[model samples]
Target: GSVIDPSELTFVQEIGSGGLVHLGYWLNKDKVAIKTIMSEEDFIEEAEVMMKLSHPKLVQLYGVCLEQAPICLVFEFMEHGCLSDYLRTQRGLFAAETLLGMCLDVCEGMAYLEEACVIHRDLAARNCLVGENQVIKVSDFGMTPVKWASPEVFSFSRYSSKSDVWSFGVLMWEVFSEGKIPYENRSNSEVVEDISTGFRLYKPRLASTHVYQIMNHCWKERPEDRPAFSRLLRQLAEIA
Candidate 1:
């Protein structure tokens, strides 16, 4: 029996965006997460991509329903919600060890994605969901773009696994700083220009020196200079 039968469920209010996610209870006496696509093209593309992925670190794709105007995606509910929201609410509450553990989990996920040649372009803390057991799951692929077979044939907007590494670096900063906003006081255009010119936010006072160094390496101006996920994972593991 299907846990979520579209005909039996009520239309819950929107929970989040990029793609609209809704909070709804299923027929099985359990709550389930549902993501709705705003655009037809995005709905089709996401459905195709999600069907191919099956990873513990990545959010589980329970099913997809396309009968309605906006296609809906079903997923298991995450109890703790997003890492960004949790960290922001509990600023500086986490012990250093806990922070390190979370970072390691994120690296593990990134390593797996790189091995599969999948690039999670949006690797911010907001996209990382935490479960009841404190396990981290990477979510939100709305901004993700698959790497093309040929570099020359790829559009400028298309990014590689290295780009994911860059975002991970930014995410690390967010975690250590207790969810402080990234690129504060800088306009989007200015931030782009700075990044293009090798400018990056300096290591915060609270982060470990080794972690700072790793983050610095990740944000190097040239994509080629970014550390491989495997290398970064090993380095981060050694820090703990």
Candidate 2:
């Protein structure tokens, strides 16, 4: 991958953070995100994965600055930051149309991932970014997914695009709930057992039956039972 001049990168506010990475702005107007990662192989792998991916709904990875010590990945900055923060801060300010539009953006991005045969390993409202003009793009980022993850990733280390579908279902619930905790007031200990018993998160207060039904389809016990991202994109497009 091509490397950029590290000196040109300027430090700005920290925008997002998670295990192994903390995302921040490089330059005010450049609108570029800079991430210093721990592992060389990990950076290379992600660099490879993201380079192969190109879509408006998906985060664009410019390249890795391998010349630096730990190596940093530069990317286009997302104006609104991550989706979860935006939803939480703007709660009660969104209309059904806006919420549905966010979902559609993420679904299209994930559908693109499906076409590329990439398993995000992590998918949730927090893993997505929102930009100007209501732009939403999916990013593979996270931890503590007893609530958002599929049973397969729960039971074994197994992962695939289908497993991501299950996470996407939880993501739908998150979107409709406007950043409500997956199981509000419930401990992680209780979530797994209940999930094994066919428990589903309660529908969002104002979510329609049509949207809730799609959420239910994602929670089906069998991994294969989950709808593909392509189908999700189509259904959301029509419904929205």
Candidate 3:
């Protein structure tokens, strides 16, 4: 099948929307996730960052439609949507083996990004798209930034690959909890306060002890304490 031009594509139903982006269908067959820009400069900057990256587990970009009324990004479709939604809707349905497989897939994706010097600063299950054959594609590159620059070079707000590893730790919790929202019993502010004070969430009830240990190491307060993505990948593959 030939790739469809963004201009020729038609909009289908809206699938989801965050404050900055909207997802929907295109041409009734393709799933199109568009990020409408609130500011052109900011959007272009992020898009440039994303355009430079390519990986099998990462979402594939079709093309950018800047000539359109609203600048939009055309992306490959994922029929099953995000892993977070799936886990939420079908809690406890996955076996331990299946869960391990999913975690391994995520680790593979993160490892690819880390190797490319890209930091996926927000690697929650919601950012992972599920495809046919249970393949997982990591999406939402907007939050990712290049690593290796000094903190003074970029704003302190930017994260290194190590910070991404921390996000992965949170993601581990989400996966083992069957997609329960983080800090479910606490307010967002409370959760931040707890984290600021070095309080961490308890281990998932049924998750493997090894997995829990990895998560703990990943979420350590000091970024230096986190294991390299390659090391983490090897450990996860062994368990899987």
For model 2, how does the per-residue alpha-carbon lDDT over 15-100 read when each residue is reduced to its tens digit? 55673344444433566777777557776777767777788888887666777686777877788888888889989988888888
Per-residue lDDT value at 63 in model 2: 64
In model 2, where do residues sit more than 4 Å from their true spots?
19-29, 141-144
Q: Rank the candidates by TM-score, best first.
A: 2, 1, 3
Candidate 3 per-residue C-alpha lDDT over 6-104 given as tens digits, one digit per residue, 9 for 90 to 100: 655666556767534456556566566655546765655565666677776777765565755566666677777889998888796777777777777
Better of 1 and 2 by TM-score: 2
lDDT for predicted candidate 2 compared with the true structure: 0.79
> Which 10 successive residues of model 1 have the least lDDT summed?
145-154
lDDT of 1: 0.73
Reference-based TM-score of each model:
0.85, 0.91, 0.83
How many clashes show up in model 2?
A: 0
TM-score of 1: 0.85
